[PDB]
Structure formats: structure tokens, C-alpha cells
Amino acid sequence: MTQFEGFTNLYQVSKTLRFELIPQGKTLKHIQEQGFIEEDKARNDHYKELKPIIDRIYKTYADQCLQLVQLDWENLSAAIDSYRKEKTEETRNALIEEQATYRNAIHDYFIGRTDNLTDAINKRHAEIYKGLFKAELFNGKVLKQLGTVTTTEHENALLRSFDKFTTYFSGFYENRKNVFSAEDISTAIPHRIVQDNFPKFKENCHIFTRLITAVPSLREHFENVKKAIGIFVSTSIEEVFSFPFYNQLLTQTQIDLYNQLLGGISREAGTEKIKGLNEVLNLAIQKNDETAHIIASLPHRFIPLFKQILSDRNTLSFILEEFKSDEEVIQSFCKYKTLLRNENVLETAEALFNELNSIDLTHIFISHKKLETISSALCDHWDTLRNALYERRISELTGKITKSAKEKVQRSLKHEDINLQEIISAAGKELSEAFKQKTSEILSHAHAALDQPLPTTLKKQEEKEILKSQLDSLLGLYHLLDWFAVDESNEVDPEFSARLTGIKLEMEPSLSFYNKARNYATKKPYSVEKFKLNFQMPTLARGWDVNVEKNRGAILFVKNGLYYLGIMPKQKGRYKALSFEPTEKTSEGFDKMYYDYFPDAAKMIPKCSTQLKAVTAHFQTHTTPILLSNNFIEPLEITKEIYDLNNPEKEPKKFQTAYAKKTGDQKGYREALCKWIDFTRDFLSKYTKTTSIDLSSLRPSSQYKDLGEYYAELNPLLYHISFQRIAEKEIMDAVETGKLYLFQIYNKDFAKGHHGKPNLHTLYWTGLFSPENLAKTSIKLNGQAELFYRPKSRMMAHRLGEKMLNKKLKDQKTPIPDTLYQELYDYVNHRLSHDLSDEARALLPNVITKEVSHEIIKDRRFTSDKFFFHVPITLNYQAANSPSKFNQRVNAYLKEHPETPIIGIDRGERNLIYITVIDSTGKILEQRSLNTIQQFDYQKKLDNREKERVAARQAWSVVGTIKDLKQGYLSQVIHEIVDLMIHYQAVVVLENLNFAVYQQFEKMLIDKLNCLVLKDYPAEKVGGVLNPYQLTDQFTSFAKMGTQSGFLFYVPAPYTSKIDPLTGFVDPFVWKTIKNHESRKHFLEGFDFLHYDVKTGDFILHFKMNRNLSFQRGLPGFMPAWDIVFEKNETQFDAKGTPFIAGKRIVPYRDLYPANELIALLEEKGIVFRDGSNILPKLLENDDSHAIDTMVALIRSVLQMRNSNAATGEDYINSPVRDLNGVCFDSRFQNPEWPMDADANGAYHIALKGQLLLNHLKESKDLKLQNGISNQDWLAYIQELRN
RNA sequence: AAUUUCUACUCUUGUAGAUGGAAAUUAGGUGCGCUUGGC
DNA sequence: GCCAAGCGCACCTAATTTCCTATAGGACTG
DNA sequence: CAGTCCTATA
Ligand SMILES: [Cl-]
Ligand code: NA
Ligand code: NA
Ligand code: NA
Ligand code: NA
Ligand code: NA
């Protein structure tokens, strides 16, 4: 039966290992003498220049084909609708099939197989497409059919720089196939049209139809937005939101226009933006009238389309010119500063503001658009000035002060500019004083800016800060001048207005200088990057096989446990085999690898037999057999039957499973499969490369059930490596003469002083070349290796005479906090310029300092030029390339192991990650926040790093990365989770994110469990390097992932945190529906009683679940009724003796004590309750709307079981119901058998949603997990278990 | 405070854990500036 | 001061595709 | 006209 250790050797996994390459002997001198590094840098530079030129071909061709597309989209829309309605596997599969059909229909325009075009056009497209993904791209023939474009002389020089080297673009061809492919892939244009943009466009049509049906006037508004923008001029707004127009939204220029219909168009900064549809809808909602509420109740925001793949974006909005150099910015700004001085702008501004002390302020106007900005800059609150003006005007109204009269005053404050005297009279003399202070500060900063000189360059950050500071000062004055109203309606002071307009006009360029300078100064400086090395060999290191060594130039050696890469360059422009000579193992020397590989037999056997041009040519005119002798030890016969099998008139091939699944005749399929497999055996027994391989471990051909099973057993037999000793002198002579470039393959596990555990990656590598792996392959060495040169990129070091400071004190567990660490480090190195702090001096006897005996240099690896080697490997080589039924295999194990524990992993409000481990019945075994791992607080560190990045962006300085810190943290989380998983043999349950540290964590955890090696395990045990665990399903993408990946499960987050762990109770009410006095009374009427319990001091509110249905979320759960309890507000104590108050609630924050507040309410009303009578009829019949609202708010508070206050550290769960045994749950007791806080409660119920999945898998007769967990099923399940 | 590279370290000229590269594309985010509005 | 809808710029981050090849074919060399 | 070696498979 199943075993946990059986989850091994289930599918192949590819990884890349990276190493430094240390040149040996005269290798580096020879490389330098030959100039290989400089010419590879040049070839990389030429590639970077040539790629955008070549992309003109792809972009022009795709755009020309897209302009011809015309499809009927109704069938795809219907398949989308049916899937959305039914949400079944059948309708999902139907939509998937429909998407494939639509992607293919787009694709037929690229390849010229569409009925919608003529034969002549289709043939031209086929001729073009046939040469788009190979070196024919460069001949320029394709240029003749795209337009009148020819290539310039410089373009011809770039093209010629890849003569006999176009396979440098081998990968690029694949990247471009990924653009045109009809497959279901996100890189491709058909996918982009069919699965990204059409659903968006289809939803916009629905949004439009609902909006203009409910509010027909929006039709005219929308049409007028289109006409004002001047786009789609001969298409009505209705047609823009109809399916046939989508055929006109496939090219980027059309997509750009559509998105600007939605989004509008901006001109220069400081001028009015042209509104799009979404802004019009937003403004309509913000009117807050009756129409606004109707619009807001409907979907009211259109969705912009994604870009077309590869296309260049264009905009109708204004684009600033850009500065190009330090001297352009500084000199241009310096000329502007001098103009401002010459124009006496500062002197005039000061004179104007000084005039305000003695001129008539009733003719000085403040812009009503600026009033809240000014209130914020001058007063306590943004609304101080608005409220003061409102109050003053109300006090000037004549007659009765009605509600409409008040509203009129309110609306007038939005519509009219305000004279300065009214503001001063409304707000008082301290507004005047604040006004004077702000003016002086602004003017004084602008003055100091004009007088201060600019730096010589912008190379140093301090120089950038001078520039930014002076720009901030002038922009401040620009903002200040814009406080004043400009409208000609206001009775403006004539001379004051003319002078203000003058200096405003002169201040206008400040805005453009500000934006242009920021756009330049925040650019990332020139950075050193590694580049690929070729040594003038176009096919360098693409394969290791003995037959390709001369042309690929790459070989491997082992000597005394150290590994070496050999590179063999051309000699005087010619390839020349080195022909190393095997010698006895008694001889001093190097072990050279001999690599023997016949790649993927599914393609290589047809390539070398049935698909030969001579075979294909022969079978067009003949039916007799053809015999092959080249590269065969005895002739290989190809019959018409064998040829026809691999070359059917129509797919699928008869020996593929698809022929059996469709045709349904298994006699034909099994015969064809046996005949093909027999043919491969015939081929392999004779082909030069494979004739010597012993294949007798394969089954008789008829016994294989499908071709994938056969190839999965065959391919492992087609790969072998071995070693032969090469004499020392032959290798050293080859390096001495420059015939061999020899590098040690290096990482620090090969350092002389190495003595600890190796990196996992070192273990993969030494495992690969171990005797056991040589005897039977678990790890294969793959071709397509790459070499890089990384120039030095850094210039901080601990020098010999100095001291270093351990981060941990003498006890080797207490870390020194950062500010203390810096102070102590400076102090022990006699660089502290002041007294040691009290706390630092207290720590001083318990620190550990190290004498620097050898220099330790920060970033040392980046301070010199280095060589690097990236080499792919495949682990679990004996398995198939993909698993079959991985999830069912896990579920078979889980059904035989019903005691499998469960690890629940939640993302918290105050915790990055929280884990709860439960046994199979739900008992908590462990629970832990992962904010801190080994006394390092990653939560604090990450929060501090993000604050630093925000401040850096604001200051125009270097933005420090955060992804490396995130990865470092997550690697520690992975280590802990996996260790728990292996120790407990547990399932892991995560939040299904459809319902960022957490999402990246999910991918890293899945990926680790695709191929899990534990470095302490013996190589031959499961989990050791030669037998990795495989506990998750093969990862493809997040989009292509269900709710189970092997031992990992995904569950919906709802009702996992705000749920009572003792009962499964949740707040059943939707509080938005309890909104006025009448609905509050109906709500109270739906409760059986509220009464006081003299025995305990609690109040009991009895609720039947079939009442108050209009106010419920529709989730009746399992229990027919609940006793909701107002707990007596008495002191309780947690496990450590810390007091808390029972029943306390934290509400919007203030502490609330509902039972005490209920008592106070009842005594205010004179309502007798200490006799146990029902309280609700008394409140209802008295009908005091304030008392009834208080009652309802108290009930809502009691039912808010999660209570949080970031200021106090509170985040607890206190249930409003008692459980089976009388207990009202409170996490503040800190009982370690139950959730210790709200986040732990979430992780607990996450795990239990996994338990529900496992229990239903138990009670079923199949191996299929249920897909998803509805909220009612979850609540009924957990409430039934707990009650 | 050393690294294939990342994070955390320093009994240890190095230690513990992690680490699938390269190319290509796309999406999103943060910050700043601005527009019209809401509070 | 916060927020909504939207535009411009700077840079940072993450997801998803492909390949992980010896040999057939034939253009270039001389 | 062969051997070499880049291109593009299957
Ligand atoms: Cl919840
Ligand atoms: Na180590
Ligand atoms: Na990559
Ligand atoms: Na932005
Ligand atoms: Na605004
Ligand atoms: Na904005």
C-alpha cells in the first residue's frame, strides 16, 4: 500500500546551477591576447542595436494582418456567459475549446489559411510566415512585401556583423514564435485578443447598456465626450459598445484611441484635462443627488484594453521635452534663476503681499478651488476656513434659518471665489497672522534659492539635493501665487491684479523646470552588467556530446575532487580536435568526461529516418520500401505503412492516444502503437549512435499501453556519461599553447578552509558525478550551458589594524540593536565623536570584538572582473517529463492515511505569515507567527526598508531594493514549513487568492516541493540528492492551477478569522441592511428575547436562524438558534496573570463594555431588568428611536468578535456565544490549545477547511477532491462538528 | 563582515538556510507633478 | 489633509512563455 | 568537388 516515501521519481525537474570560473595558468593571458572578451561585448552591443530594427518586421506584419481580421464574436460571448452561469467542468471545457477556435481563427490570418481572404493574399502570408522565425529574416526579401522600406548603410553594417553568426538569434526566434502562436499562452497575440481584451470589451458593452437604460441622458454625455475628443468619428457611441466594433480594436493605435475615450487626454501641466467616459461617470456620482445614487448602484467604470503584443504605445496627451545632461539642467535652470532676479519677481511679490496690510481686502479674491488647500496650510483642519465661512454667512441670513437656506449657503461656498476680508472676518486674527507667517517663509525660501549657486554637476546626491531644494522653493512661490482667484467676474483690484498676473506669468516656467528636472535627476545611472561569451563560436557550449565537442568547444574535467571547464577555441579561424588520449588510472592527470546522448527519441528517430528528404521524396511517387544505409550498421527499412503512420493525412497519428479517444477503435490504435514501437527498436538497434546500447530492459513492444509510457522508459537509456584519465602533461601543454582555456568551476564550498555543510546546489553537482549516479542516472547534465563575463561594479572594508563587532553579545543569542551596534562599532574602533550612550556603555562588557587578521571586504565579489558558468541539470531523470494523475496519487495516499496532520498557513493583519499545525481531528499541535525567525524580526526590517524606499523616491535618491530582502525572509519561511511538513508528513493548506509577500511565498513553496532534497539525508534515501521528494504537482503557471497541487491545498479565505473556534458561530447579519429606525425595529422584533441572568450577570439574546431573514447573509449554518451573550464585564486573567475585561469590544477607536452599557441604557429608560423579564418588548413599545439605535449598536458590537487596536497590541477573538460546555471563547486567556490571537484563528480555520476537504475525500469512493468550499457547506460542517 | 547569487551571520581565510537560468513579453506597484471634483 | 476618476514622468516587482540537442541539410570555402 | 561548418530541424 501507499507510503510517504513513495512520492519520489514522479516527474523530471530542470534547474540551473551557477558557478564562478577561475582561469588556470596561461588561460587568462591568452584570452586577453586574443581579444575575445571585447568582441563578445561588441557582439552583445550589436544584438541590442539590431533587435529593435528586426522587430519592425514583426510589428508591421502583425499589424497588417490584424487590420484584415473580421470575426463574429457571438459564439465566444455565449461560451463565456454559459461558463459564468453554470460554473461546471463541462462549460469550462466548452469555453476552453471555443477560445482555441477563436485563437486559431486569428492565427489563420498570420499563416494564410483563412477563408475570409483570397487565395492570392493567403499565399503571400504563407510565404512571409515561413521565413519569419529563421535567418531569412535578415535577407531583406521580407522587406519588399511589407512596404517601400529599405535598410540604411548603418543597418547593413549591423546585419553583416552577424554573418555566419545568425544563430545568436536562436532564442530570439522562439521568443517571436511565442508572439504569433495560436496556443493558450500569455505571450501571444491571439491569446491577447481572445482571452484578455475581448472579455474586457464585452463587459464594457454590458456596462454601457445597463447605464444608458437606467439613465438615458448618459447616452448624450458619452457621445459628446467622443465628439469632443474627436475620435471614432464615423462610429456612434452605441456602435463603439457593440461586438462588431471589436474587430476594429485589435491594433495598438485603435486600442490607444479606445483607452483615451475611456481615460481622456491631458495637455501641459496646469491646464484643464479633457475628460473621458470614466471621469464623466465619476463626476456624476460625486454630485450626490438622486441620479448619482442610481449611477453608483450600477457598474460605473469602463475597463481599458491591454496593449497588443510588441506594439509601440502612442498617446494624444502632452509629452514634455526631456533634459539630456547635467549641464543642460544646471545651465538652463541657472539662466532661468537670473531672469527671475533681473525681472525683480521676488521684490514685486514681497511688495504685493506687503500691500495686503493696508489695501481694501474686499477686492482681493481667493480661488474657491484653493480654499481647502489654504485651510490645510494655515489652519488646524482642511475644513476650518469652509466651516468658518459657513457659520458667518448663516449668521447673516434674514428670517427663519431653514434647512434649504442652510443648503443654499453650503452650495454657494463651492461656486464663488471668496474675498480675503470675509475669510479674515470669519476665521479671526490668527488667520491673518498665519497668512503673514506662511508668506514670509515661502518668499524667504525663494529668496535663499535665487541667491544660492547651483552645483557644478549632479554626480553627487548632495548636488541633486541642492537642485531639488531650489526647485521646491520656486514651486512653493508658484503655488502661493495660485491661491488668488483669476475669474473676470470678481471685482478685482485693478493694479494689484495686473501686478499679480505679471509675476505669475514669470513664474509659469517653474512648473516645467520642476517636472523636467525630476524626470532627468531620478534616472538610473549607467550600470555594469554581465554579458554572454562566445569566443567567436556560434554554437559554443550548446551540447556536451562526444560528437559535438569540437564544434561546441566545451568539456568537463575532475581532478582531486575539483571540477574544471575546458573551452577549446578555433585555431587561426579553424576548428581542430584536441584528441586527448585516455591513459591508465595509475597516471597523474585529469578525469575527462565522455558524454553520450541521443536526444528526445520522439523527434530524433523521425528526423533520422522517416522524415529524411530522400524518404519523403521517394514516397510521393512510390509505394515500395526504401532502405537506409548511411549511419546504420545494417540497413533500416522504411515501409509505406511506417511512413504513413508518422505522416497521416490528418492528425492525430494512429499510434497516439487521441486516435483511440476519438475513433474509439482500440484494435487499430494498439496495432499502430506496436508497429511504431517495433520500428523504433529496429532503428535504435542499427543507428550508429545507439546500436551499442542495451535496450533489453524494455518490455515487449505490444505490452506498452501508450507511446508516452514507452518514451519515458526509453529516453533514460539513451544518455550516459563516463570518465577517462588524461595525462597531466597533455592538459597542461594544451593550456600553455592556448589550445585549451581551462577554468576551475568554483563556489565557496571548494574553498581551502571549507569545512561545513555544502549548498544544496553543490550537492546537486557532486551528486551528478558520484559513482552511484554514473551507474544509474538520477541527475542528468544538460546542454545549452552559458558563459558570462561580469566586469567589476563596486569600489567599505575592515582593514588589518581595526576591530569588528559581533552582532550578538557574549551569550551568542542576544543581538545588539542597530543604533547601539553602530555606536559600539565606532567606539571600539576609536571613531566615536561623543560620549557612549548609557545603554551602549552598559552592553560594553558583553560585546565580542574581533581583531582583523585578514581584510574582509563588503561586496568583494563585485570589486574585480569575473567569469561565470550557468549549466542546466535535470533531476528525477528516471521519470517521465510530466506526471500522470499526480493529485489522485496523493489522494490515494491520504485515504489510506486518515491521521495525516494539516499545516494551515495564513497571511495576517499584524503578521506576514502565521502557521497553525493541527492533527487530523483539529487539535492544535503548534501555532506560530513567522514575523521573527531566529531573533531576526523580518516584519520590522521589511517595513523599515519600504519606508526608506518611499523617502528615497521623494528625495530623488537611489531606491534600495526590497525583493532581495523578501526572498531572504521567504527562504527561511520555506525552510521552516518544509521541515514541519516532512516531520509531520502533513498536508499544507493555503488561502485561495482569487477570493505580496504571501503570493510569492506560495510559488516558492510549490517550487521547492516539486523537487525536495534535504542536504543531511543520505543520497540513496528518499529525500536524498539521488531520490528527491516530489510532494507538489508539476508547476506550470498560477493561471493553470486548480485548488490542489499534490499535498498543497487552496481554500477560500471567507469565514476563517471572524468565526468562533469553539462553536463555528459567525455574525449572520449584513449590517448595511439595518439602516433606519423602521428596519432597526424589525431587526429587534426578530429576536425571541433579551433578558438578564441574575445568576451570572450576563444578558442573553436568543435568536432563531429562521428570523430576520431580510437582514441575514443567507448562511443558516447548522444550528437552529443561538444564545447571544452580553458577558458581564468582569476581570479575568490569562495564563501569565495579565488581566483583561470580559466582553470588551474595540469599536470606531474606543473601548466598549456592552453589558455595562446595556445596564446604563436600561436604567436611563427606567426599564426593569433585574427580574429576568424580556427587555425587547419594553424598548419597542416605548419606541425611543435613540434608545433603539443604541440597543442595535450594542448588539452589533457584541457580535463583532474580532477586536483590534494597533496602538495597544490588541487583536483578539471573543465569541458572543457559549459553547456546548458553557464556555464563551476568548483568545485573551492565552490558552495554547486554542488560537492565541485573531491571525492564529485564521490559520486554524484555514487548516480546518483543509480538514473538510480530507474528510469528504474520505467518505467518497473516488480519488478526486471536491472543487472549492461554499460558505454554507463550510459553516454547516464546522458547526455540526463543534455542537 | 567574505558568497554562483540572495538573506542572516562570524567558533571557523569562512558559517546556516535558500537559490531555474537565459531570452522575450506583459501586467502591476511605489513616488512625484498636474486636471476636474468629493469629504 | 484624505479620497475618486484620469493623464505625464522616474524606477521597482512579478508572472508566463520558450529552450536547455545531435544531426540532417546545404552554403560556403578554396 | 571535397571537406568544413553554420542553420534549422524532428
Ligand atoms: Cl473571516
Ligand atoms: Na555551508
Ligand atoms: Na529568468
Ligand atoms: Na503611478
Ligand atoms: Na484635486
Ligand atoms: Na492620482
Coordinates of C-alpha atoms in Angstrom, one line a residue, chain A residues 836-1075:
Chain A
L836 CA 28.9 56.4 24.6
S837 CA 25.2 56.3 25.4
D838 CA 24.2 54.8 28.8
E839 CA 22.8 51.7 27.3
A840 CA 25.8 51.1 24.9
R841 CA 28.2 51.5 27.9
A842 CA 26.1 49.0 29.8
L843 CA 26.4 46.5 26.9
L844 CA 30.2 47.2 26.5
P845 CA 31.4 44.3 28.8
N846 CA 29.2 41.8 27.0
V847 CA 30.1 42.6 23.4
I848 CA 32.5 40.5 21.3
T849 CA 35.1 42.2 19.1
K850 CA 37.3 40.5 16.6
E851 CA 40.8 41.6 15.6
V852 CA 41.0 42.0 11.8
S853 CA 43.7 39.5 10.9
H854 CA 42.8 39.5 7.1
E855 CA 40.8 42.1 5.3
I856 CA 37.1 41.4 4.9
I857 CA 35.6 43.5 2.1
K858 CA 31.9 44.2 1.6
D859 CA 30.8 43.3 -1.9
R860 CA 34.3 41.8 -2.5
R861 CA 32.9 39.6 -5.3
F862 CA 31.9 42.7 -7.3
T863 CA 35.2 44.5 -7.0
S864 CA 37.0 42.6 -9.7
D865 CA 36.2 41.2 -13.2
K866 CA 34.9 37.6 -13.1
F867 CA 33.8 34.7 -15.3
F868 CA 30.7 32.7 -14.7
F869 CA 29.2 29.4 -15.8
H870 CA 25.4 28.6 -15.9
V871 CA 24.6 25.0 -16.6
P872 CA 21.3 23.2 -16.5
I873 CA 20.6 19.9 -15.0
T874 CA 17.6 17.6 -14.8
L875 CA 16.7 15.8 -11.5
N876 CA 14.5 12.7 -11.2
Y877 CA 15.8 11.7 -14.6
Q878 CA 14.3 8.2 -14.5
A879 CA 10.7 9.6 -14.5
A880 CA 8.5 10.9 -17.3
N881 CA 8.8 14.6 -18.3
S882 CA 5.3 15.2 -16.8
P883 CA 3.4 13.2 -14.2
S884 CA 0.1 11.4 -14.7
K885 CA -2.7 11.9 -12.2
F886 CA -0.4 13.3 -9.5
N887 CA -3.3 14.6 -7.4
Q888 CA -5.1 11.3 -7.4
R889 CA -1.9 9.5 -6.3
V890 CA -1.7 11.9 -3.3
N891 CA -5.4 11.4 -2.6
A892 CA -5.0 7.6 -2.6
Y893 CA -2.2 8.1 0.0
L894 CA -4.4 10.4 2.0
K895 CA -7.3 8.0 2.1
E896 CA -5.0 5.2 3.4
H897 CA -3.6 7.7 6.0
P898 CA -6.6 9.3 7.7
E899 CA -4.4 10.6 10.5
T900 CA -2.4 12.9 8.2
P901 CA -1.9 16.2 10.0
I902 CA -2.6 19.6 8.5
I903 CA -0.5 22.8 8.3
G904 CA -2.6 25.9 7.9
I905 CA -0.8 29.0 6.6
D906 CA -2.4 32.4 6.8
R907 CA -1.5 36.0 6.0
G908 CA -2.2 38.1 8.9
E909 CA -3.2 41.7 9.6
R910 CA -0.3 42.1 12.0
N911 CA 1.7 39.0 10.8
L912 CA 3.3 38.5 7.4
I913 CA 2.7 34.7 7.8
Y914 CA 1.0 32.7 10.5
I915 CA 1.0 29.0 10.9
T916 CA -1.2 26.6 12.8
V917 CA -0.5 22.8 12.8
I918 CA -3.4 20.6 13.7
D919 CA -3.8 16.8 14.0
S920 CA -6.4 15.1 11.9
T921 CA -9.2 15.8 14.4
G922 CA -8.5 19.5 14.7
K923 CA -6.4 19.6 17.8
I924 CA -3.8 22.3 17.7
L925 CA -0.2 20.9 17.9
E926 CA 1.7 24.1 17.1
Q927 CA 0.9 27.8 16.3
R928 CA 3.4 30.5 15.5
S929 CA 3.8 33.9 13.9
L930 CA 6.6 33.9 11.4
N931 CA 7.3 37.7 11.8
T932 CA 10.5 36.8 13.6
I933 CA 12.8 33.9 12.6
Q934 CA 15.8 33.2 15.0
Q935 CA 15.6 36.6 16.8
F936 CA 15.6 38.4 13.4
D937 CA 12.4 40.5 13.0
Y938 CA 11.8 40.4 9.3
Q939 CA 8.5 42.1 9.6
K940 CA 10.2 45.2 11.2
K941 CA 13.1 45.0 8.7
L942 CA 10.7 44.9 5.7
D943 CA 8.5 47.7 7.0
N944 CA 11.6 49.9 7.6
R945 CA 13.0 49.1 4.1
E946 CA 9.8 50.1 2.5
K947 CA 9.7 53.4 4.4
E948 CA 13.3 54.0 3.2
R949 CA 12.4 53.4 -0.4
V950 CA 9.4 55.8 -0.2
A951 CA 11.7 58.5 1.3
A952 CA 14.3 57.9 -1.4
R953 CA 11.8 58.3 -4.2
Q954 CA 10.6 61.5 -2.6
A955 CA 14.2 62.8 -2.2
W956 CA 15.2 61.8 -5.8
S957 CA 17.9 59.5 -4.4
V958 CA 18.7 55.8 -5.0
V959 CA 15.9 53.4 -4.3
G960 CA 17.2 50.4 -2.3
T961 CA 15.9 47.1 -3.4
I962 CA 13.4 45.2 -1.4
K963 CA 12.9 41.9 -3.4
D964 CA 16.2 40.5 -2.1
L965 CA 15.2 41.1 1.5
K966 CA 11.8 39.5 0.7
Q967 CA 13.5 36.5 -0.9
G968 CA 15.9 36.1 2.1
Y969 CA 12.9 36.1 4.5
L970 CA 10.9 33.7 2.4
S971 CA 13.7 31.2 2.2
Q972 CA 13.7 31.0 6.0
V973 CA 9.9 30.5 6.0
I974 CA 10.2 27.8 3.3
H975 CA 12.9 26.0 5.4
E976 CA 10.6 26.0 8.5
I977 CA 7.4 25.0 6.6
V978 CA 9.1 22.2 4.8
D979 CA 10.7 20.9 8.0
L980 CA 7.3 20.8 9.6
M981 CA 5.8 19.1 6.5
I982 CA 8.5 16.4 6.5
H983 CA 8.4 15.8 10.2
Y984 CA 4.6 15.5 10.5
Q985 CA 4.1 14.0 7.0
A986 CA 1.5 16.7 6.7
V987 CA -0.7 18.4 4.1
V988 CA -0.2 22.2 3.8
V989 CA -3.2 24.4 3.3
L990 CA -3.0 28.0 1.8
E991 CA -5.5 30.8 1.1
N992 CA -7.0 30.6 -2.4
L993 CA -6.0 34.1 -3.6
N994 CA -8.9 34.5 -6.1
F995 CA -11.3 35.1 -3.1
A996 CA 2.6 40.4 -2.0
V997 CA 4.8 38.5 0.4
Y998 CA 2.2 35.7 0.6
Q999 CA 1.7 35.2 -3.1
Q1000 CA 5.5 35.0 -3.8
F1001 CA 5.7 32.6 -0.8
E1002 CA 3.1 30.3 -2.5
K1003 CA 5.1 30.0 -5.7
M1004 CA 8.4 29.3 -3.8
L1005 CA 6.8 26.7 -1.7
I1006 CA 5.2 24.9 -4.6
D1007 CA 8.5 25.1 -6.5
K1008 CA 10.6 23.8 -3.5
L1009 CA 8.2 20.8 -3.2
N1010 CA 8.4 19.9 -6.9
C1011 CA 11.9 18.6 -6.1
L1012 CA 12.8 18.5 -2.4
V1013 CA 16.4 17.5 -1.4
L1014 CA 17.3 17.6 2.3
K1015 CA 21.0 18.1 2.5
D1016 CA 21.5 15.9 5.6
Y1017 CA 19.8 12.8 4.1
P1018 CA 21.9 10.0 2.6
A1019 CA 22.0 10.3 -1.2
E1020 CA 20.1 7.0 -1.6
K1021 CA 17.3 7.7 0.9
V1022 CA 14.1 9.3 -0.3
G1023 CA 14.8 13.0 0.2
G1024 CA 18.5 12.5 -0.6
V1025 CA 20.0 14.1 -3.6
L1026 CA 19.6 11.0 -5.8
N1027 CA 15.9 10.4 -4.7
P1028 CA 14.3 13.8 -4.2
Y1029 CA 10.9 14.1 -2.7
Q1030 CA 8.2 15.3 -5.0
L1031 CA 5.2 16.4 -3.0
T1032 CA 3.6 19.1 -5.2
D1033 CA 2.2 18.7 -8.7
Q1034 CA 4.4 20.0 -11.6
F1035 CA 4.2 23.7 -11.6
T1036 CA 3.2 25.3 -14.9
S1037 CA 1.5 28.6 -14.0
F1038 CA -0.8 30.1 -11.4
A1039 CA -3.5 30.6 -14.0
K1040 CA -3.4 26.9 -14.9
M1041 CA -3.6 25.8 -11.3
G1042 CA -6.6 24.2 -9.5
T1043 CA -7.2 24.1 -5.8
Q1044 CA -4.9 21.1 -5.2
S1045 CA -1.2 20.7 -6.1
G1046 CA -0.4 17.4 -4.5
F1047 CA 0.0 17.8 -0.8
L1048 CA -0.8 21.5 -1.0
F1049 CA -4.4 22.7 -1.0
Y1050 CA -6.0 26.1 -1.5
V1051 CA -9.2 27.1 0.3
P1052 CA -11.3 30.3 0.3
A1053 CA -10.5 32.8 3.0
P1054 CA -14.0 33.9 4.0
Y1055 CA -15.2 32.9 7.5
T1056 CA -11.8 31.8 8.7
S1057 CA -10.9 34.8 11.0
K1058 CA -14.3 36.1 12.3
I1059 CA -15.5 32.7 13.5
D1060 CA -15.7 31.3 17.0
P1061 CA -13.3 28.3 17.2
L1062 CA -15.5 26.7 19.9
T1063 CA -18.8 26.7 18.0
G1064 CA -18.3 27.8 14.4
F1065 CA -20.6 30.8 15.1
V1066 CA -20.3 33.8 12.8
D1067 CA -22.2 37.1 12.7
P1068 CA -25.1 36.2 10.5
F1069 CA -26.2 39.9 9.8
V1070 CA -25.5 42.2 6.9
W1071 CA -25.3 45.5 8.8
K1072 CA -25.8 47.7 5.8
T1073 CA -29.5 46.4 5.7
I1074 CA -30.1 47.8 9.2
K1075 CA -30.0 51.4 8.3

